[PDB]
């Protein structure tokens, strides 16, 4: 086509989706990770995660307002990944890298899994 | 903070939100523009438009499944802007620029209004 493109548009959309999440506006699901609860937008979760994409395209699960993750999932690892989904920024640290990589593998977030593997390999 | 950032994350999220729109997955509103209907996600519309942000933060309108736009709004102009919201690409042409600018002004999409004004000024 002969379209023009606004370079900062995708980043501006994601920034506003994060502002809606912070103010709890039009969040339509709560993700339960052991004792912890995280409110989010189903569309953003699906857009970022192979696991959520599979869950919310399922004809029965698409209608659930609560999703319980596997008990082995670490709430902090989930929190870091949820923040990444809404910001593009990953808070990866020596103290959380193992939990973040395990959560990214479960959530099917291949680019996160890739950077965790590389950061771990460098420390060996 | 000490975060790392994935450069293509925002663009990848927007690409997946557009794929969900094309397959009509978790769309929660229909925008009526005269005889034409457009299905979309309320969160994306709010993230892109000052008008939709005001509409869906309203305690009564947030729950509506149908929104009717002003009869002066051109369906093609709306279609071009809806495509821009989901892709960052604006199909701006001599034949549609006046309708696109008028629709962007109504929808409160200031960056689109700005490029339309500049493209019009250059043709004068």
């Amino acid at each position: 086509d002969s379209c023009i493109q606004f370079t900062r548009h995708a980043s501006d959309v994601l920034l506003n989706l994060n502002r809606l999440r912070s103010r709890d506006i039009l969040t339509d699901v709560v993700i339960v990770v052991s004792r912890e609860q995280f409110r989010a937008h189903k569309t953003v979760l699906m857009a970022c995660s192979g696991l959520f994409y599979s869950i919310f395209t399922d004809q029965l699960k698409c209608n659930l307002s609560v999703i319980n993750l596997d008990p082995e999932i670490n709430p902090e690892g989930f929190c870091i990944l949820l923040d990444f989904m809404y910001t593009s920024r990953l808070n990866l640290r020596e103290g959380n890298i193992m939990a973040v990589m395990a959560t990214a593998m479960y959530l099917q977030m291949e680019h996160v899994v890739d950077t965790c593997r590389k950061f771990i390999k460098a420390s060996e | 903070d000490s975060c790392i950032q994935f450069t293509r994350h925002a663009s990848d999220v927007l690409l997946n939100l557009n794929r969900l729109r094309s397959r009509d997955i978790l769309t929660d509103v229909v925008i009526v523009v005269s005889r034409e209907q457009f299905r979309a996600h309320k969160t994306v519309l709010m993230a892109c438009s000052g008008l939709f942000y005001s509409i869906f933060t309203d305690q009564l309108k947030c729950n509506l499944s149908v929104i009717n736009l002003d009869p002066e709004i051109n369906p093609e102009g709306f279609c071009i802007l809806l495509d821009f919201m989901y892709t960052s690409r604006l199909n701006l042409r001599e034949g549609n620029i006046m309708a696109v600018m008028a629709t962007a002004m109504y929808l409160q999409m200031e960056h689109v209004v700005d490029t339309c004004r500049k493209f019009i000024k250059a043709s004068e």
């Binding site: 023009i4 493109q5 606004f6 370079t7 | 604006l90 960056h111």
Partner: peptide, 4 residues
């Protein structure tokens, strides 16, 4: 704005 750019030519993509």
């Amino acid at each position: 704005w750019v030519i993509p």
